[PDB]
JSON list of C-alpha atoms and ligand atoms in Angstrom, two decimals:
[
{"chain": "V", "resi": 8, "resn": "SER", "atom": "CA", "xyz": [83.64, -53.74, -12.56]},
{"chain": "V", "resi": 9, "resn": "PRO", "atom": "CA", "xyz": [85.53, -50.67, -11.34]},
{"chain": "V", "resi": 10, "resn": "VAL", "atom": "CA", "xyz": [89.20, -50.16, -12.25]},
{"chain": "V", "resi": 11, "resn": "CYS", "atom": "CA", "xyz": [92.10, -47.97, -11.12]},
{"chain": "V", "resi": 12, "resn": "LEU", "atom": "CA", "xyz": [92.62, -44.97, -13.42]},
{"chain": "V", "resi": 13, "resn": "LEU", "atom": "CA", "xyz": [96.42, -45.27, -13.14]},
{"chain": "V", "resi": 14, "resn": "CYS", "atom": "CA", "xyz": [97.08, -49.02, -13.55]},
{"chain": "V", "resi": 15, "resn": "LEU", "atom": "CA", "xyz": [93.76, -49.92, -15.25]},
{"chain": "V", "resi": 16, "resn": "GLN", "atom": "CA", "xyz": [93.34, -53.01, -13.04]},
{"chain": "V", "resi": 17, "resn": "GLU", "atom": "CA", "xyz": [90.70, -54.18, -10.58]},
{"chain": "V", "resi": 18, "resn": "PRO", "atom": "CA", "xyz": [91.08, -53.65, -6.77]},
{"chain": "V", "resi": 19, "resn": "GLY", "atom": "CA", "xyz": [93.20, -56.79, -6.42]},
{"chain": "V", "resi": 20, "resn": "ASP", "atom": "CA", "xyz": [95.52, -57.36, -3.43]},
{"chain": "V", "resi": 21, "resn": "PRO", "atom": "CA", "xyz": [95.42, -54.38, -0.99]},
{"chain": "V", "resi": 22, "resn": "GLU", "atom": "CA", "xyz": [98.66, -55.56, 0.64]},
{"chain": "V", "resi": 23, "resn": "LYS", "atom": "CA", "xyz": [100.38, -55.03, -2.72]},
{"chain": "V", "resi": 24, "resn": "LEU", "atom": "CA", "xyz": [98.44, -52.15, -4.32]},
{"chain": "V", "resi": 25, "resn": "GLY", "atom": "CA", "xyz": [96.85, -50.50, -1.28]},
{"chain": "V", "resi": 26, "resn": "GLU", "atom": "CA", "xyz": [93.16, -49.81, -0.68]},
{"chain": "V", "resi": 27, "resn": "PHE", "atom": "CA", "xyz": [90.98, -49.08, -3.69]},
{"chain": "V", "resi": 28, "resn": "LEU", "atom": "CA", "xyz": [89.79, -45.48, -3.30]},
{"chain": "V", "resi": 29, "resn": "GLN", "atom": "CA", "xyz": [86.63, -43.98, -4.81]},
{"chain": "V", "resi": 30, "resn": "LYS", "atom": "CA", "xyz": [86.08, -40.26, -4.55]},
{"chain": "V", "resi": 31, "resn": "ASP", "atom": "CA", "xyz": [85.63, -37.31, -6.85]},
{"chain": "V", "resi": 32, "resn": "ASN", "atom": "CA", "xyz": [84.33, -39.54, -9.66]},
{"chain": "V", "resi": 33, "resn": "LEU", "atom": "CA", "xyz": [87.70, -41.27, -9.67]},
{"chain": "V", "resi": 34, "resn": "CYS", "atom": "CA", "xyz": [88.84, -44.79, -8.77]},
{"chain": "V", "resi": 35, "resn": "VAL", "atom": "CA", "xyz": [92.49, -45.39, -7.84]},
{"chain": "V", "resi": 36, "resn": "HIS", "atom": "CA", "xyz": [94.66, -47.70, -5.76]},
{"chain": "V", "resi": 37, "resn": "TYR", "atom": "CA", "xyz": [96.31, -45.90, -2.86]},
{"chain": "V", "resi": 38, "resn": "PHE", "atom": "CA", "xyz": [99.79, -47.19, -3.77]},
{"chain": "V", "resi": 39, "resn": "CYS", "atom": "CA", "xyz": [99.27, -46.26, -7.42]},
{"chain": "V", "resi": 40, "resn": "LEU", "atom": "CA", "xyz": [98.69, -42.72, -6.13]},
{"chain": "V", "resi": 41, "resn": "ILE", "atom": "CA", "xyz": [101.71, -42.44, -3.82]},
{"chain": "V", "resi": 42, "resn": "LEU", "atom": "CA", "xyz": [104.07, -44.32, -6.18]},
{"chain": "V", "resi": 43, "resn": "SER", "atom": "CA", "xyz": [103.01, -42.56, -9.41]},
{"chain": "V", "resi": 44, "resn": "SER", "atom": "CA", "xyz": [106.26, -40.99, -10.60]},
{"chain": "V", "resi": 45, "resn": "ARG", "atom": "CA", "xyz": [105.12, -37.50, -11.62]},
{"chain": "V", "resi": 46, "resn": "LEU", "atom": "CA", "xyz": [102.01, -36.88, -9.56]},
{"chain": "V", "resi": 47, "resn": "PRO", "atom": "CA", "xyz": [101.89, -33.63, -7.51]},
{"chain": "V", "resi": 48, "resn": "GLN", "atom": "CA", "xyz": [100.26, -33.58, -4.07]},
{"chain": "V", "resi": 49, "resn": "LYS", "atom": "CA", "xyz": [98.91, -30.03, -3.85]},
{"chain": "V", "resi": 50, "resn": "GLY", "atom": "CA", "xyz": [96.01, -30.38, -1.50]},
{"chain": "V", "resi": 51, "resn": "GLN", "atom": "CA", "xyz": [95.64, -30.25, 2.22]},
{"chain": "V", "resi": 52, "resn": "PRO", "atom": "CA", "xyz": [94.99, -33.66, 3.87]},
{"chain": "V", "resi": 53, "resn": "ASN", "atom": "CA", "xyz": [91.18, -33.29, 3.85]},
{"chain": "V", "resi": 54, "resn": "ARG", "atom": "CA", "xyz": [91.14, -32.35, 0.17]},
{"chain": "V", "resi": 55, "resn": "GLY", "atom": "CA", "xyz": [90.98, -34.50, -2.94]},
{"chain": "V", "resi": 56, "resn": "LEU", "atom": "CA", "xyz": [92.25, -38.01, -2.24]},
{"chain": "V", "resi": 57, "resn": "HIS", "atom": "CA", "xyz": [94.58, -37.52, 0.73]},
{"chain": "V", "resi": 58, "resn": "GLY", "atom": "CA", "xyz": [95.82, -34.25, -0.79]},
{"chain": "V", "resi": 59, "resn": "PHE", "atom": "CA", "xyz": [96.07, -35.63, -4.35]},
{"chain": "V", "resi": 60, "resn": "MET", "atom": "CA", "xyz": [93.76, -33.44, -6.35]},
{"chain": "V", "resi": 61, "resn": "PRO", "atom": "CA", "xyz": [91.49, -35.03, -9.00]},
{"chain": "V", "resi": 62, "resn": "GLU", "atom": "CA", "xyz": [92.77, -32.67, -11.73]},
{"chain": "V", "resi": 63, "resn": "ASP", "atom": "CA", "xyz": [96.37, -33.66, -11.09]},
{"chain": "V", "resi": 64, "resn": "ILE", "atom": "CA", "xyz": [95.47, -37.38, -10.97]},
{"chain": "V", "resi": 65, "resn": "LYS", "atom": "CA", "xyz": [93.73, -37.13, -14.31]},
{"chain": "V", "resi": 66, "resn": "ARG", "atom": "CA", "xyz": [96.65, -35.24, -15.82]},
{"chain": "V", "resi": 67, "resn": "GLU", "atom": "CA", "xyz": [98.90, -38.02, -14.59]},
{"chain": "V", "resi": 68, "resn": "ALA", "atom": "CA", "xyz": [96.64, -40.59, -16.31]},
{"chain": "V", "resi": 69, "resn": "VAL", "atom": "CA", "xyz": [96.98, -38.55, -19.49]},
{"chain": "V", "resi": 70, "resn": "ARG", "atom": "CA", "xyz": [100.76, -38.42, -19.33]},
{"chain": "V", "resi": 71, "resn": "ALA", "atom": "CA", "xyz": [100.87, -42.14, -18.64]},
{"chain": "V", "resi": 72, "resn": "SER", "atom": "CA", "xyz": [98.50, -42.91, -21.53]},
{"chain": "V", "resi": 73, "resn": "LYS", "atom": "CA", "xyz": [101.50, -42.21, -23.80]},
{"chain": "V", "resi": 74, "resn": "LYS", "atom": "CA", "xyz": [103.80, -44.63, -21.91]},
{"chain": "V", "resi": 75, "resn": "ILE", "atom": "CA", "xyz": [104.06, -48.36, -22.63]},
{"chain": "V", "resi": 76, "resn": "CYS", "atom": "CA", "xyz": [104.44, -50.84, -19.76]},
{"chain": "V", "resi": 77, "resn": "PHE", "atom": "CA", "xyz": [107.48, -53.05, -20.38]},
{"chain": "V", "resi": 78, "resn": "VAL", "atom": "CA", "xyz": [105.64, -56.00, -18.79]},
{"chain": "V", "resi": 79, "resn": "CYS", "atom": "CA", "xyz": [102.23, -56.12, -20.51]},
{"chain": "V", "resi": 80, "resn": "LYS", "atom": "CA", "xyz": [103.10, -53.90, -23.52]},
{"chain": "V", "resi": 81, "resn": "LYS", "atom": "CA", "xyz": [100.00, -51.73, -23.01]},
{"chain": "V", "resi": 82, "resn": "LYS", "atom": "CA", "xyz": [99.68, -47.98, -22.49]},
{"chain": "V", "resi": 83, "resn": "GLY", "atom": "CA", "xyz": [98.95, -46.22, -19.19]},
{"chain": "V", "resi": 84, "resn": "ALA", "atom": "CA", "xyz": [102.25, -46.94, -17.37]},
{"chain": "V", "resi": 85, "resn": "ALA", "atom": "CA", "xyz": [102.55, -44.32, -14.62]},
{"chain": "V", "resi": 86, "resn": "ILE", "atom": "CA", "xyz": [105.64, -45.56, -12.82]},
{"chain": "V", "resi": 87, "resn": "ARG", "atom": "CA", "xyz": [109.13, -44.98, -14.10]},
{"chain": "V", "resi": 88, "resn": "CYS", "atom": "CA", "xyz": [112.25, -46.74, -12.92]},
{"chain": "V", "resi": 89, "resn": "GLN", "atom": "CA", "xyz": [114.14, -44.10, -10.94]},
{"chain": "V", "resi": 90, "resn": "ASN", "atom": "CA", "xyz": [117.61, -45.07, -12.08]},
{"chain": "V", "resi": 91, "resn": "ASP", "atom": "CA", "xyz": [118.73, -42.04, -14.09]},
{"chain": "V", "resi": 92, "resn": "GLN", "atom": "CA", "xyz": [119.88, -44.07, -17.07]},
{"chain": "V", "resi": 93, "resn": "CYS", "atom": "CA", "xyz": [116.76, -46.25, -17.32]},
{"chain": "V", "resi": 94, "resn": "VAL", "atom": "CA", "xyz": [113.67, -45.69, -19.46]},
{"chain": "V", "resi": 95, "resn": "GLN", "atom": "CA", "xyz": [111.53, -48.62, -18.25]},
{"chain": "V", "resi": 96, "resn": "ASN", "atom": "CA", "xyz": [107.96, -47.67, -17.31]},
{"chain": "V", "resi": 97, "resn": "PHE", "atom": "CA", "xyz": [105.32, -49.95, -15.80]},
{"chain": "V", "resi": 98, "resn": "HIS", "atom": "CA", "xyz": [101.91, -50.36, -14.19]},
{"chain": "V", "resi": 99, "resn": "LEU", "atom": "CA", "xyz": [102.42, -51.05, -10.46]},
{"chain": "V", "resi": 100, "resn": "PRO", "atom": "CA", "xyz": [100.78, -54.55, -10.49]},
{"chain": "V", "resi": 101, "resn": "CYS", "atom": "CA", "xyz": [102.81, -55.50, -13.57]},
{"chain": "V", "resi": 102, "resn": "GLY", "atom": "CA", "xyz": [106.09, -54.37, -12.01]},
{"chain": "V", "resi": 103, "resn": "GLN", "atom": "CA", "xyz": [105.32, -56.48, -8.95]},
{"chain": "V", "resi": 104, "resn": "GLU", "atom": "CA", "xyz": [105.28, -59.60, -11.18]},
{"chain": "V", "resi": 105, "resn": "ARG", "atom": "CA", "xyz": [108.75, -58.82, -12.53]},
{"chain": "V", "resi": 106, "resn": "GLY", "atom": "CA", "xyz": [110.59, -57.99, -9.35]},
{"chain": "V", "resi": 107, "resn": "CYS", "atom": "CA", "xyz": [110.29, -54.25, -9.44]},
{"chain": "V", "resi": 108, "resn": "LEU", "atom": "CA", "xyz": [110.97, -52.57, -6.08]},
{"chain": "V", "resi": 109, "resn": "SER", "atom": "CA", "xyz": [108.87, -49.78, -4.58]},
{"chain": "V", "resi": 110, "resn": "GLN", "atom": "CA", "xyz": [109.97, -47.58, -1.67]},
{"chain": "V", "resi": 111, "resn": "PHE", "atom": "CA", "xyz": [107.46, -46.04, 0.74]},
{"chain": "V", "resi": 112, "resn": "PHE", "atom": "CA", "xyz": [109.47, -43.01, 1.88]},
{"chain": "V", "resi": 113, "resn": "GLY", "atom": "CA", "xyz": [111.03, -39.81, 0.54]},
{"chain": "V", "resi": 114, "resn": "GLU", "atom": "CA", "xyz": [110.29, -39.38, -3.16]},
{"chain": "V", "resi": 115, "resn": "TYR", "atom": "CA", "xyz": [108.53, -42.80, -3.05]},
{"chain": "V", "resi": 116, "resn": "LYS", "atom": "CA", "xyz": [110.80, -44.18, -5.79]},
{"chain": "V", "resi": 117, "resn": "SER", "atom": "CA", "xyz": [110.43, -47.43, -7.72]},
{"chain": "V", "resi": 118, "resn": "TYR", "atom": "CA", "xyz": [113.07, -49.44, -9.59]},
{"chain": "V", "resi": 119, "resn": "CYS", "atom": "CA", "xyz": [113.11, -52.14, -12.19]},
{"chain": "V", "resi": 120, "resn": "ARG", "atom": "CA", "xyz": [114.70, -55.40, -11.10]},
{"chain": "V", "resi": 121, "resn": "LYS", "atom": "CA", "xyz": [118.06, -54.59, -12.70]},
{"chain": "V", "resi": 122, "resn": "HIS", "atom": "CA", "xyz": [118.20, -51.32, -10.83]},
{"chain": "V", "resi": 123, "resn": "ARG", "atom": "CA", "xyz": [117.17, -52.37, -7.31]},
{"chain": "V", "resi": 124, "resn": "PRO", "atom": "CA", "xyz": [119.41, -50.26, -4.98]},
{"chain": "F", "resi": 201, "resn": "LIG", "atom": "ZN1", "xyz": [96.22, -49.07, -9.63]},
{"chain": "F", "resi": 202, "resn": "LIG", "atom": "ZN1", "xyz": [101.41, -53.34, -17.49]},
{"chain": "F", "resi": 203, "resn": "LIG", "atom": "ZN1", "xyz": [115.59, -49.64, -14.37]}
]
């Protein structure tokens, strides 16, 4: 049963996590890609996964493997609350159960519930 490399969950609800993408030997939710806090987009649009290069995605999985999700208490949390004085990290699906807010513009920031702008 395939899982997203960034949140470690199954395809789930595409309205909440985006389409489940499979390319370059990787599986990832589209929103996990665009909301991942420190993921560079260094490719042209027809490269990698919409310009997100497989190497960078994997490096982002590695960075996140050292971060604990405040919701489920497991490693692999790739999203960080973007309030400057907050250290909460979370998997996207987990954050969505606890009122975390994601923005789909600009730096594509997310916030924990206490820091919703
Ligand atoms: Zn995901
Ligand atoms: Zn989690
Ligand atoms: Zn916060």
